[PDB]
Design a protein around this nucleic acid. Structure first.
Ligand code: GTP
Ligand code: MG
Ligand code: MG
Ligand code: MG
Ligand code: MG
Ligand code: MG
Ligand code: MG
Ligand code: MG
Ligand code: MG
Ligand code: MG
Ligand code: MG
Lengths: 212, 435, 115, 51
RNA sequence: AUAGGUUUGGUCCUAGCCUUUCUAUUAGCUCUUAGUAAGAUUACACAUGCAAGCAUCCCCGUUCCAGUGAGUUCACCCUCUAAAUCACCAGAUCAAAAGGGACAAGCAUCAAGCACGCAGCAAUGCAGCUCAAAACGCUUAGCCUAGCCACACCCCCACGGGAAACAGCAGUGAUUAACCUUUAGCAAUAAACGAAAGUUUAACUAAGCUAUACUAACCCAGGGUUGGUCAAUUUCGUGCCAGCCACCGCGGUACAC
């Protein structure tokens, strides 16, 4: 049991961590793209077929904000995918930008803003996910009020739904065994389970980063 | 024991018969341009890329003529040693192109090739090469061949003589035309269906592909999965490949194909026959091995009866050793069974037994192995490798164990080394000669 | 084995012999082999009909509930089995496969009639 | 595709409700076995008998 | 063990060896069929093909599965508490690192190890700690099998170097007494990914080869033995020769060759 140090292992771990940190790839390198092969040159990996037209047609968030004073801070930005998916207005209210100066045209980086989805805002500003994606569009200063015009529909959300047949039978039998005389139908509550569409932006702050 | 052997199918019916490409074997004397002629026809230059500029392997190539026809050229070694290879080529050939150097005329190996052509009963086309150089006398060549019965057309002889110059590639078009004409006259045909029949042209062990045999199909088509039996060995065809190594789906008659998947390495020239399945193939192989064992047992019974009669005569009347210095023990390792057999024939020609014995401890095909080194150590022998490799580990082990591994790439260089060793063992220069 | 990451999953480990599939419902760490270690066995499933034309399924419902509460995921076949048992709603793919089968049957019925 | 998407949405909502019910049941069972009248009474009874 | 044969001129006792039983590998001779299970001798070297993608780009995965047994008391319990799942949370589940305890065989002709302890905040002080109840050391071995531990070409490690890696599937050279297909499919289960239809998977499923084994069958049966232990030999040939034997033994004109 008398141990024998793994000194080289620990040293190599430390050195690899240092090398990764000091050679950390730039965002402009990671999220670069070739518009002929539709492959990111940094990794050489091809983009999905369903993203080809968007990559060839629409533009990136920072690629747009590069043409706005203070990077359009305070403007409203919307995504082509959102425009095609939801009739209700959806957008980010830009609040901060950290561009990738190493980029030739400052067409990459990070952004923070306040999300409005389906006409519902978000209480606090957070990071923008999918910034590098090629489906971003800018909301002109004019038409902003008309575009963001929206009134909520009646809050359609069922309180409860029937239990699955066997579960309902089991609950009823348990009640009868306990002696409860209640004939009330057992209904599974669904209010607390607030469904949120799959395209709802995710917590970018917890999202990982590429490596090389 | 019932006879479960697999026997070549009886001659196919004329209805089954079908046109097949011809097999032409280029035979001649040393450095008379056989491989150069073959290079010209193939449009590829290999004569320059050779060890000693000598053809030491009976190689098959499926050349396509400009007219679109296909011919299987077997380029055979021209040296005196490879008599077995030349004979096997003559056996498998449909036509024999005898290349004779106009400068040097007929030679011993040229006469040997003519004799093999007669034995195989194959039409002979004379290619008088080196015609460009002075003293080139095709008329003299024909006149001398008259002695060996190769009569040219000019002298009312069926054999067609063609003056060519493989170096300058002149008249080769007419040579190919004559080859096509002779093939047409022979009217070669064979069944392209049913169990396959072929002949092994070469065998070897490849470190990546296993036991690989270069064969020529004679009847029926070969495909992946066919079960082949040849001699005492059998295979389930795993990979068919060409001279270039490109996998080929099918092997039609008169095509040279390298076959992988032999459970054991067959001997050169043996017949390959297709059988129904693996159990049937193993049955055939067991029967053949049993027949060979019975023959050997009869011979051994003769010898043992001699010994036992001697001992009985001795008895009824009454009612390790250190090896001598003059005994060279040799291991032989070859790249192919053909080379191994050639070296073994050279050894068997030995006749200087009195002055120094030449014991053949073991022979095989493949790189010098640890077992070869162990045999050499056990018998204080010498390993001779013909175009095989001696890895670094094997070299270290041989150095430790006192064995001598001598790799070689030319048959006559190896033979010179062998005679050198025999002379060294002698108490002077050896009296045995290879030829 | 110190498994980096992973989570529990209620899945069908396959046993039986060749041509005789049989399943043990196992609450097993997802990364562990299909037939390897498992935290707990929660029942069984015989896919081949018995003499009575039944596909016996045993579900340790109490333990299945316990493991769902503890956070075990559910493999798609197990979700379908529970849906059939009525412990869960019918799987959307169960419903959609039924609809696809109905449409294919209607097409084949039309083809047969047009004869 | 649309019918399937709606089916998945409803199915996952109901499944998550069921999962929450089971999680609550597990929490209740563990808290029960830990500090419920039965367990606490048994512990105090054991202590009294020991004394 | 329900025991049996064998020491001697003979008996008793002690004792070793061997026989009878059951497996597995190899070999010899022999072999018809169907279902199923299992399958390089080797941590030696490898041609070839394939084995990791998914997806509206980011992420996630390729750390899994599968493989081998070279190494080897990192495997089990308790404490503590990382990572991961429970849509965010909750403590719950799972389980690293760390601490405590337990944990293979042989050799003592391996008997001493040589700092292997403690106190103090530190300074520094004490001179101690393990060990014939086996320390220290050498050799051997994967284990305690719903599976677990270790390794991943070698230098324990892997920054670096040696060098160019099948111990993934199929396959091959070498080596050994030891030797399966360079099959098909994602139809099922599992995994990865996706919101999802779905896509990928040499995992796996279904097939291929093999009397290695079990089950079932055929109106086409061999192998071994025949002095005693031990079931069962007629006549010849040989004549202490040829030869046979698990042990006792046979053969100098034979139920033992
Ligand atoms: N003078 C002359 N030399 C030629 C001609 N064709 C070939 N050669 C040369 O003759 C020599 C022998 O040719 P090879 O093909 O190597 O000899 P071979 O006859 O096949 O002999 P093996 O080595 O036994 O196969 C080489 O140097 C050739 O280049 C020709 O037409 N004239
Ligand atoms: Mg030549
Ligand atoms: Mg056997
Ligand atoms: Mg070991
Ligand atoms: Mg000693
Ligand atoms: Mg290592
Ligand atoms: Mg290796
Ligand atoms: Mg393999
Ligand atoms: Mg092999
Ligand atoms: Mg075996
Ligand atoms: Mg007698």
């Amino acid at each position: 049991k008398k141990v024998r140090p793994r000194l080289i292992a620990e040293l190599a771990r430390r050195v690899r961590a240092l090398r990764e940190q000091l050679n950390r790839p730039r965002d402009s390198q990671l999220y670069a793209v070739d518009y002929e092969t539709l492959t990111r040159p940094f990794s050489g990996r091809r983009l999905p077929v369903r993203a080809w037209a968007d990559v060839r047609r629409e533009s990136r968030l920072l690629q747009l904000l590069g043409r706005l004073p203070l990077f359009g801070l305070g403007r409203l930005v919307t995504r082509k995918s959102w425009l095609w998916q939801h009739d209700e207005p959806c957008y980010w209210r830009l609040t901060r930008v950290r561009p990738d100066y190493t980029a030739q045209n400052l067409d990459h980086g990070k952004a923070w803003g306040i999300l409005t989805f389906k006409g519902k805002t978000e209480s606090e500003a957070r990071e923008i996910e999918h910034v590098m994606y090629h489906d971003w569009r800018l909301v002109p200063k004019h038409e902003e009020e008309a575009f963001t015009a929206f009134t909520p529909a009646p809050e359609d959300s069922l309180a409860s739904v029937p239990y699955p047949p066997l579960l309902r039978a089991m609950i009823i039998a348990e009640r009868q065994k306990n002696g409860d005389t209640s004939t009330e139908e057992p209904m599974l509550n669904v209010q607390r389970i607030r469904m949120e569409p799959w395209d709802y932006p995710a917590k970018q702050e917890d999202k990982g980063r590429a490596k090389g | 024991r019932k006879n479960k052997d697999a026997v070549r199918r009886p001659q196919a019916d004329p209805a089954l018969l079908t046109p097949r490409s011809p097999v032409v074997t280029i035979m001649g004397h040393v450095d008379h341009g056989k491989t150069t002629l073959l290079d010209k026809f193939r449009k590829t230059q290999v004569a320059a890329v050779e060890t000693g500029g000598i053809t030491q392997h009976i190689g098959a190539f499926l050349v396509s003529l400009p007219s679109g026809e296909k011919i299987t050229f077997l380029d055979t070694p021209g040296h005196a040693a490879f008599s077995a290879m030349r004979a096997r080529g003559a056996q498998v050939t449909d036509i024999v192109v005898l290349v004779v150097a106009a400068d040097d005329g007929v030679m011993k190996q040229t006469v040997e090739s003519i004799q093999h052509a007669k034995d195989a009963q194959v039409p002979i086309i004379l290619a008088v090469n080196k015609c460009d150089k002075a003293e080139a006398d095709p008329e003299k060549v024909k006149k001398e061949l008259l002695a060996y019965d190769v009569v040219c057309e000019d002298y009312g002889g069926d054999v067609q003589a063609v003056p060519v110059s493989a170096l300058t590639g002149d008249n080769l078009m007419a040579l190919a035309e004559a080859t096509v004409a002779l093939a047409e006259m022979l009217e070669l045909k064979a069944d392209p269906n049913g169990p396959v029949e072929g002949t092994v042209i070469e065998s070897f062990t490849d470190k990546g592909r296993g036991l690989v045999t270069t064969a020529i199909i004679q009847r029926g088509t070969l495909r992946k999965g066919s079960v082949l039996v040849a001699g005492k060995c059998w295979a389930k065809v795993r990979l068919m490949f060409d001279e270039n190594g490109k996998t080929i789906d099918e092997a039609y008659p008169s095509m040279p194909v390298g076959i992988t998947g032999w459970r054991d390495l067959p001997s050169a020239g043996e017949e390959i026959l297709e059988v129904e399945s693996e159990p049937r193939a193993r049955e055939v192989v067991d029967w053949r091995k049993y027949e060979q064992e019975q023959e050997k047992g009869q011979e051994d019974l003769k010898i043992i009866e001699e010994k036992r009669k001697e001992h009985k005569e001795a008895h009824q009347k009454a009612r390790k050793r250190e090896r001598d210095s003059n005994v060279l023990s040799v291991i032989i390792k070859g790249d192919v069974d053909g080379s191994v057999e050639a070296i073994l024939n050279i050894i068997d020609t030995y006749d200087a037994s009195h002055e120094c014995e030449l014991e053949l401890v073991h022979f095989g095909v493949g790189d010098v192995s640890a077992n070869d080194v162990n045999l050499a150590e056990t018998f204080d022998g010498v390993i001779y490798g013909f175009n095989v490799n001696a890895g670094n580990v094997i070299q270290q082990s041989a150095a430790k164990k006192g064995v001598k591994i001598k790799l070689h790439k030319i048959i006559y260089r190896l033979v010179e080394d062998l005679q050198e060793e025999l002379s060294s063992r002698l108490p002077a220069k050896t009296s045995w000669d290879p030829g | 084995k110190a498994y980096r990451g992973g989570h529990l999953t209620i899945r069908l480990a396959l046993g039986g012999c060749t041509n005789r599939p049989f399943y043990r419902i196992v609450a097993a760490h997802n990364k562990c082999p299909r037939d390897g270690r498992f935290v707990e066995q929660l029942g069984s499933y015989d896919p081949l009909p018995n003499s009575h034309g039944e596909k016996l399924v045993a579900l340790n419902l109490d333990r299945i509930r316990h493991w769902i509460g503890c956070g075990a995921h559910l493999s798609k076949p197990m979700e379908k089995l529970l849906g059939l048992a009525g412990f869960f709603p019918l799987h959307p793919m169960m419903i959609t496969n039924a609809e696809r089968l109905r449409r294919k049957r209607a097409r084949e019925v039309l083809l047969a009639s047009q004869k | 595709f649309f019918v399937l998407m709606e089916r998945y949405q409803h199915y996952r909502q109901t499944v998550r409700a069921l999962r929450m019910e089971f999680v609550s049941e597990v929490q209740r069972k563990v808290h029960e076995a830990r500090a419920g009248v039965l367990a606490e009474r048994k512990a105090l009874k054991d202590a009294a008998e020991h004394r």
